[PDB]
Amino acid sequence: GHKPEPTDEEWELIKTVTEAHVATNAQGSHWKQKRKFLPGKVDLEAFSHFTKIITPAITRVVDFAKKLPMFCELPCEDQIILLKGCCMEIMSLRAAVRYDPESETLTLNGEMAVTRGQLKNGGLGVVSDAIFDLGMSLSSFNLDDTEVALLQAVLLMSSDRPGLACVERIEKYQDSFLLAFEHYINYRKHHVTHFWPKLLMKVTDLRMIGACHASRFLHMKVECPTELFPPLFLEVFED
Ligand SMILES: Cc1cc(OCC(=O)O)cc(C)c1Cc1ccc(O)c(Cc2ccccc2)c1
Ligand SMILES: Cc1cc(OCC(=O)O)cc(C)c1Cc1ccc(O)c(Cc2ccccc2)c1
């Protein structure tokens, strides 16, 4: 095939998703007049800071979803289970794409730039390695707002999260994003062989992260109290 580009209706969908994304980006991308770095084998420092931005960070993934018509058109019950399943996957994506090879740091909530270790011992553990790997891995991809946005959309519209009722519709919306995405990619023409396949594999990585983080939080879910974690963090990442 000549690799088709967006259709009239897809272009409309792409504009809609990009806007949802751009609007709920932390700053959107000018961690240049914003970010600033952090001066043990636990990091009460890094951790304390994390507890401070983790909330607005989760809040903007919710606000991204509230901005997708298809998503608003879902029963709040599925809307909840859907958000909880892709929350970490979207946050990590958003952080991964802000990896600065120079400073070898990611940028969280578009304000705090952290190192691998800082994030590793600030509460994420090996996940930090995973998101950092993904970050470096993505430089080569060169993704714009739309691609990242579509990616978040695809992650959001996962019909495999247990408890969903409107599974078929969620699958319909997803395939719909996937296609628009695939065509947007046809238009972009990245100088990367097998770019589309290579990309979808990153989604599997973001999913893995999601699962590892879930496993992670539950293992400590109750070795630690809740006096430590922001209420919103708890509403999301505990069963
Ligand atoms: C990867 C990331 C992205 C992020 O927002 C990025 C963005 O969307 O701009 C914010 C944070 C704190 C992080 C790191 C993080 C994510 C989940 C998580 O459970 C932890 C450990 C933690 C858990 C509760 C309180 C503080 C720290 C850190
Ligand atoms: C430097 C950069 C990096 C970037 O990272 C993603 C990528 O480059 O693929 C994205 C953008 C849009 C930019 C630059 C930019 C320049 C002018 C401009 O009007 C825009 C879009 C925009 C304009 C005003 C406010 C927010 C966003 C981006």
Curated annotation (Swiss-Prot):
UniProt: 3,3',5-triiodo-L-thyronine 1 binding residues: 213
Q: Which stretches does the entry tag as region Interaction with NR2F6?
A: 36-239
Give the consequence of mutating residue 95 to T: In GRTHD; impairs hormone binding
Where's it found, cell-wise?
Nucleus
The terms under GO molecular function for this entry are: chromatin DNA binding; DNA binding; DNA-binding transcription factor activity; DNA-binding transcription factor activity, RNA polymerase II-specific; enzyme binding; nuclear receptor activity; RNA polymerase II cis-regulatory region sequence-specific DNA binding; sequence-specific double-stranded DNA binding
Gene Ontology BP, a term = cell differentiation
Q: Which domain of life is it from?
A: Eukaryota
- Annotated NR LBD domain residues: 9-239
Annotated consequence of substituting residue 35 to Q: Impairs hormone binding and ligand-dependent conformational changes
Where 3,3',5-triiodo-L-thyronine binds, per the record, is at 60, 109
- Cite the entry's keywords alphabetically: Deafness, Disease variant, DNA-binding, Metal-binding, Nucleus, Receptor, Transcription, Transcription regulation, Zinc, Zinc-finger
Tell me what the record says results from residue 26 to T: In GRTHD; impairs hormone binding and ligand-dependent conformational changes
The record lists the effect of residue 94 to H as: In PRTH; impairs hormone binding
Binding positions (L-thyroxine): 60, 109, 213
Predominant subcellular localization, coarse grouping? nucleus
Family that this chain belongs to? Belongs to the nuclear hormone receptor family. NR1 subfamily.
Quaternary structure (record) = Binds DNA as a dimer; homodimer and heterodimer with RXRA. Interacts with the coactivators NCOA1/SRC1, NCOA2/GRIP1, NCOA7 and MED1/TRAP220 in a ligand-inducible manner. Interacts with the corepressor NCOR1 in absence of ligand. Interacts with C1D. Interacts with NR2F6; the interaction impairs the binding of the THRB homodimer and THRB:RXRB heterodimer to T3 response elements. Interacts with PRMT2 and THRSP. Interacts with TACC1; this interaction is decreased in the presence of thyroid hormone T3.
Disease / disorder: Thyroid hormone resistance, generalized, autosomal dominant: An autosomal dominant disease characterized by high levels of circulating thyroid hormones (T3-T4), goiter, abnormal mental functions, increased susceptibility to infections, abnormal growth and bone maturation, tachycardia and deafness. Affected individuals may also have attention deficit-hyperactivity disorders (ADHD) and language difficulties. Patients have normal or slightly elevated thyroid stimulating hormone (TSH).
Free-text comment on this protein's domains from its UniProt entry: Composed of three domains: a modulating N-terminal domain, a DNA-binding domain and a C-terminal ligand-binding domain.
The job of this chain, per UniProt, is described as: Nuclear hormone receptor that can act as a repressor or activator of transcription. High affinity receptor for thyroid hormones, including triiodothyronine and thyroxine.
Question: What's the name of the protein?
Answer: Thyroid hormone receptor beta
Please tell me the species this chain comes from.
Homo sapiens (Human)
**Parent sequence residues shown:** 209 to 461 of 461
